[PDB]
Design an enzyme around this catalytic site. Sequence first.
Site, PDB file in Angstrom:
ATOM      1  N   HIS A  21      46.924  25.128  37.949  1.00 25.53           N
ATOM      2  CA  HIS A  21      48.307  24.720  38.234  1.00 25.53           C
ATOM      3  C   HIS A  21      48.305  23.595  39.272  1.00 25.53           C
ATOM      4  O   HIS A  21      48.205  23.775  40.502  1.00 25.53           O
ATOM      5  CB  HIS A  21      49.205  25.938  38.685  1.00 25.53           C
ATOM      6  CG  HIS A  21      50.650  25.503  38.966  1.00 25.53           C
ATOM      7  ND1 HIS A  21      51.731  26.245  38.541  1.00 25.53           N
ATOM      8  CD2 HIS A  21      51.154  24.412  39.607  1.00 25.53           C
ATOM      9  CE1 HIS A  21      52.836  25.602  38.948  1.00 25.53           C
ATOM     10  NE2 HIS A  21      52.534  24.491  39.580  1.00 25.53           N
ATOM     11  N   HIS A  23      49.477  19.138  39.873  1.00 27.20           N
ATOM     12  CA  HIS A  23      50.331  17.996  39.471  1.00 27.20           C
ATOM     13  C   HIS A  23      49.763  16.676  39.971  1.00 27.20           C
ATOM     14  O   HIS A  23      49.329  16.591  41.141  1.00 27.20           O
ATOM     15  CB  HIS A  23      51.744  18.075  40.045  1.00 27.20           C
ATOM     16  CG  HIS A  23      52.477  19.352  39.772  1.00 27.20           C
ATOM     17  ND1 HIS A  23      53.264  19.524  38.623  1.00 27.20           N
ATOM     18  CD2 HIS A  23      52.544  20.491  40.515  1.00 27.20           C
ATOM     19  CE1 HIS A  23      53.781  20.749  38.707  1.00 27.20           C
ATOM     20  NE2 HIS A  23      53.366  21.357  39.837  1.00 27.20           N
ATOM     21  N   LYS A 135      55.026  25.106  30.113  1.00 25.07           N
ATOM     22  CA  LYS A 135      55.474  25.503  31.419  1.00 25.07           C
ATOM     23  C   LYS A 135      56.962  25.869  31.452  1.00 25.07           C
ATOM     24  O   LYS A 135      57.771  25.150  30.887  1.00 25.07           O
ATOM     25  CB  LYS A 135      55.119  24.384  32.440  1.00 25.07           C
ATOM     26  CG  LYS A 135      55.997  24.438  33.721  1.00 25.07           C
ATOM     27  CD  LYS A 135      55.570  25.598  34.610  1.00 25.07           C
ATOM     28  CE  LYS A 135      56.328  25.629  35.903  1.00 25.07           C
ATOM     29  NZ  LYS A 135      56.050  24.465  36.726  1.00 25.07           N
ATOM     30  N   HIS A 167      56.806  29.339  36.820  1.00 24.21           N
ATOM     31  CA  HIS A 167      57.138  29.102  38.204  1.00 24.21           C
ATOM     32  C   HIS A 167      58.057  30.262  38.489  1.00 24.21           C
ATOM     33  O   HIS A 167      58.959  30.540  37.677  1.00 24.21           O
ATOM     34  CB  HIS A 167      57.884  27.768  38.423  1.00 24.21           C
ATOM     35  CG  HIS A 167      58.442  27.505  39.818  1.00 24.21           C
ATOM     36  ND1 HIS A 167      58.004  26.427  40.620  1.00 24.21           N
ATOM     37  CD2 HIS A 167      59.439  28.154  40.509  1.00 24.21           C
ATOM     38  CE1 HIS A 167      58.731  26.468  41.740  1.00 24.21           C
ATOM     39  NE2 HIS A 167      59.594  27.492  41.706  1.00 24.21           N
ATOM     40  N   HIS A 196      52.854  31.259  41.328  1.00 20.88           N
ATOM     41  CA  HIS A 196      53.304  31.236  42.710  1.00 20.88           C
ATOM     42  C   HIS A 196      53.335  32.643  43.173  1.00 20.88           C
ATOM     43  O   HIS A 196      54.154  33.027  43.995  1.00 20.88           O
ATOM     44  CB  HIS A 196      54.717  30.635  42.862  1.00 20.88           C
ATOM     45  CG  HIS A 196      54.756  29.272  42.230  1.00 20.88           C
ATOM     46  ND1 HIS A 196      53.610  28.475  42.163  1.00 20.88           N
ATOM     47  CD2 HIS A 196      55.791  28.588  41.629  1.00 20.88           C
ATOM     48  CE1 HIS A 196      53.971  27.349  41.562  1.00 20.88           C
ATOM     49  NE2 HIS A 196      55.285  27.382  41.230  1.00 20.88           N
ATOM     50  N   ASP A 199      53.111  34.002  46.813  1.00 19.97           N
ATOM     51  CA  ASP A 199      54.258  33.801  47.647  1.00 19.97           C
ATOM     52  C   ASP A 199      54.914  35.115  48.108  1.00 19.97           C
ATOM     53  O   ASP A 199      55.930  35.082  48.776  1.00 19.97           O
ATOM     54  CB  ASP A 199      55.316  32.939  46.961  1.00 19.97           C
ATOM     55  CG  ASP A 199      55.086  31.434  46.915  1.00 19.97           C
ATOM     56  OD1 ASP A 199      53.994  31.002  47.502  1.00 19.97           O
ATOM     57  OD2 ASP A 199      55.877  30.683  46.378  1.00 19.97           O
ATOM     58  N   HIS A 220      49.505  29.034  45.530  1.00 18.77           N
ATOM     59  CA  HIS A 220      50.117  28.356  46.655  1.00 18.77           C
ATOM     60  C   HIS A 220      49.246  28.554  47.892  1.00 18.77           C
ATOM     61  O   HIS A 220      49.717  28.517  49.022  1.00 18.77           O
ATOM     62  CB  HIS A 220      51.535  28.944  46.857  1.00 18.77           C
ATOM     63  CG  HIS A 220      52.541  28.153  46.087  1.00 18.77           C
ATOM     64  ND1 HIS A 220      53.895  28.443  46.128  1.00 18.77           N
ATOM     65  CD2 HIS A 220      52.381  27.074  45.287  1.00 18.77           C
ATOM     66  CE1 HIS A 220      54.530  27.555  45.376  1.00 18.77           C
ATOM     67  NE2 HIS A 220      53.658  26.727  44.842  1.00 18.77           N
ATOM     68  N   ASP A 267      48.430  23.894  43.499  1.00 22.58           N
ATOM     69  CA  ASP A 267      49.783  23.434  43.256  1.00 22.58           C
ATOM     70  C   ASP A 267      49.959  22.147  44.081  1.00 22.58           C
ATOM     71  O   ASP A 267      50.971  21.878  44.739  1.00 22.58           O
ATOM     72  CB  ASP A 267      50.951  24.495  43.436  1.00 22.58           C
ATOM     73  CG  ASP A 267      52.335  24.002  42.956  1.00 22.58           C
ATOM     74  OD1 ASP A 267      52.298  23.064  42.046  1.00 22.58           O
ATOM     75  OD2 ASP A 267      53.395  24.412  43.363  1.00 22.58           O
TER      76      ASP A 267
HETATM   77  C1  EBP Z   1      56.627  19.726  41.384  1.00 22.70           C
HETATM   78  C2  EBP Z   1      57.171  21.094  41.457  1.00 22.70           C
HETATM   79  O1  EBP Z   1      57.672  21.339  42.827  1.00 22.70           O
HETATM   80  P1  EBP Z   1      58.112  22.790  43.281  1.00 22.70           P
HETATM   81  O2  EBP Z   1      58.604  23.688  42.225  1.00 22.70           O
HETATM   82  C3  EBP Z   1      56.764  23.356  43.981  1.00 22.70           C
HETATM   83  C4  EBP Z   1      55.852  22.723  45.040  1.00 22.70           C
HETATM   84  C5  EBP Z   1      56.125  22.853  46.397  1.00 22.70           C
HETATM   85  C6  EBP Z   1      55.280  22.258  47.412  1.00 22.70           C
HETATM   86  C7  EBP Z   1      54.160  21.546  47.043  1.00 22.70           C
HETATM   87  C8  EBP Z   1      53.207  20.904  48.092  1.00 22.70           C
HETATM   88  C9  EBP Z   1      53.862  21.385  45.663  1.00 22.70           C
HETATM   89  C10 EBP Z   1      54.710  21.984  44.658  1.00 22.70           C
HETATM   90  O3  EBP Z   1      59.162  22.540  44.476  1.00 22.70           O
HETATM   91  C11 EBP Z   1      59.879  21.275  44.757  1.00 22.70           C
HETATM   92  C12 EBP Z   1      61.232  21.522  45.256  1.00 22.70           C
HETATM   93 ZN    ZN Z   2      56.210  25.553  40.596  1.00 23.64          ZN
HETATM   94 ZN    ZN Z   3      53.834  23.267  40.297  1.00 27.28          ZN
END
Ligand code: EBP
Ligand code: ZN
Ligand code: ZN
Lengths: 329, 329
Positions: A21, A23, A135, A167, A196, A199, A220, A267
């Site tokens: 997981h 990006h 996803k 997620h 996650h 968490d 995470h 993540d």
């Molecule tokens: C791209 C998806 O972001 P997310 O679901 C999760 C997310 C939070 C923090 C970090 C360092 C990476 C990813 O939260 C953004 C509001």
């Molecule tokens: Zn996420």
């Molecule tokens: Zn993610």
Amino acid sequence: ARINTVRGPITISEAGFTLTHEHICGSSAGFLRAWPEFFGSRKALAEKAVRGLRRARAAGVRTIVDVSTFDIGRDVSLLAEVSRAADVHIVAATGLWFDPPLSMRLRSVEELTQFFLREIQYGIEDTGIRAGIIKVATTGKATPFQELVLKAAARASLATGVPVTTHTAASQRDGEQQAAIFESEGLSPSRVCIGHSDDTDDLSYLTALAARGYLIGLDHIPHSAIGLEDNASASALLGIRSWQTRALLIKALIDQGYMKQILVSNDWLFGFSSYVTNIMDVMDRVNPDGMAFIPLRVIPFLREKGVPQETLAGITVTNPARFLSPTLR
Amino acid sequence: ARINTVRGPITISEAGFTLTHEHICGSSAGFLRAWPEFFGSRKALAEKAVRGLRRARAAGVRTIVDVSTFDIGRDVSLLAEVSRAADVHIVAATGLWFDPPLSMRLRSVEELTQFFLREIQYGIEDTGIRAGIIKVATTGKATPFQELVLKAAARASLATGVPVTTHTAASQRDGEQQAAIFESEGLSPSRVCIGHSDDTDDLSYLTALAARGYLIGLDHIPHSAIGLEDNASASALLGIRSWQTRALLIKALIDQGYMKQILVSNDWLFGFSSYVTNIMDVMDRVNPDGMAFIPLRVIPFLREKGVPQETLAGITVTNPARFLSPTLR
Ligand SMILES: CCOP(=O)(Cc1ccc(C)cc1)OCC
Ligand SMILES: [Zn+2]
Ligand SMILES: [Zn+2]
Ligand SMILES: CCOP(=O)(Cc1ccc(C)cc1)OCC
Ligand SMILES: CCOP(=O)(Cc1ccc(C)cc1)OCC
Ligand SMILES: CCOP(=O)(Cc1ccc(C)cc1)OCC
Ligand SMILES: [Zn+2]
Ligand SMILES: [Zn+2]
């Protein structure tokens, strides 16, 4: 037999050490192409990403699963480029996250299924690059729309054999509602990774899902705003539990006999437009290892707490291979 | 001096009969690229568009302003292709509508201003195509974010001389709050057009704004779900006022002496993914003339009601030229 990557299909054995997981960039549909300077430049961003991936590669990482959906502004061309430069396998996703535009919000389960299949069978955009995972996301009780997404994901999965990763709002036990939905569609828990999950400190929630066959994503790990509470935004995003605490959940599950059900990741990302401006600065300060955090800090840490090396290898090589292998009912 | 089109700059004289609020396609950022089959095919959509534009051209239309913003899924390369093929000038837009993603929602007035300027001065994406107008919107009382959008649109207008055109909930008298913010920015009303104004019967509202120097956008003439009360969806979207009712507002304004402030259009499109499925079908039925509706149907009607031809030429040719010409304070 094979897994779809942005560079083509690879055999199971080629995947190696895989981060389930991650990006390359966290953005919005069309954003990177309309406002590349937001990230300095497209070139700047890709360079950053390549460097990051080369560092993870040096640590043993062979493959990453970029779970960026269309609404996360996934750019498959950017993914193919950096994969080639860093020489790291990258698996692309299909699916929807929580920021769908109207054109998506107004679709039925049947239409969404169609789109998901398109991404997987036909390929992304006009590239011929096929998604290798689906996803989905919730963040507390699912919205009616979300439920649709969930069903569509299930159906697409049932047709292709491609896994589903989610997620969740761990603390809200979203995993439970997700499972309920997937099961109702006939989806087998072994094709689902509830993410996650680190968490929450509620082991009992995790063990109940694990028991049912689900895969638990402890992704995470490196997220911690510890010693940054002077920053609301960072605190809100990363939380204040330490990385050690999160890591311990991995051992905790191993200890309960669920090693075959664990998937771990960071993540992480190299760019992030879907949050406050300059947030990356904070992040790179929190975890200078980036995606190499897992192999560099977590593996040794668990080893040191008594986890057998062989066990760590199963988690980072074996579990993923099984998860990713397209498997039909 | 010159106006920016997707084929380049043209002289004011070259614009001729101009349609000020239209769209080649009503969609979402990245959608067209991600799911072109939703419109049958990109080629099909493009063919439909060329035909439609050729027919308007045959009725006298030389230029159209496609007010599709980034969030509307504007695809400049698409605009460029049909423009070339139909031999009609097309003016592209910058700004934001009401479905912005997270990556935009989180920006500051200053960052938004920069994006707008980028599209206008540097070009859209990497094409070098420059926006010739700024599009903003409200759907009743403005949201905090919308207020930001309005300030940024104002600022970019002030620096480049490009006009601003808006989407209103006329019924709600949005125009009033719009003007208020623009004015708070030092923006001349003469650089603003308050759109979808035929959507209300409130001549008091209208004349007020006109009196103030704002341009009144009567661009919903053909929208009517009369005889379609069977369709909740089309009813909601279209209204139940006849086209004649709307058309007459044009006469009214002329009657009060506001001929130089009127702008007329159809707010038509050839594709629409941001609404219920199959809605276009419904639309094509309601108005087979498409964008030619104005010259074919409205002009003669107003003629028949007493409006001097000469006056009709001012509304369709003179007004637009003037509004569109980049003008600094
Ligand atoms: C791209 C998806 O972001 P997310 O679901 C999760 C997310 C939070 C923090 C970090 C360092 C990476 C990813 O939260 C953004 C509001
Ligand atoms: Zn996420
Ligand atoms: Zn993610
Ligand atoms: C994108 C349009 O293709 P299609 O309808 C069917 C299709 C699937 C696979 C390949 C290799 C070609 C075409 O998409 C699947 C749902
Ligand atoms: C893309 C902009 O569409 P609009 O703001 C208004 C709109 C309604 C109907 C027609 C025929 C054109 C335009 O629609 C909301 C969903
Ligand atoms: C890199 C994007 O260009 P820029 O930063 C400055 C810039 C504007 C116009 C031209 C012709 C070149 C460069 O955009 C202005 C807001
Ligand atoms: Zn509108
Ligand atoms: Zn419009």
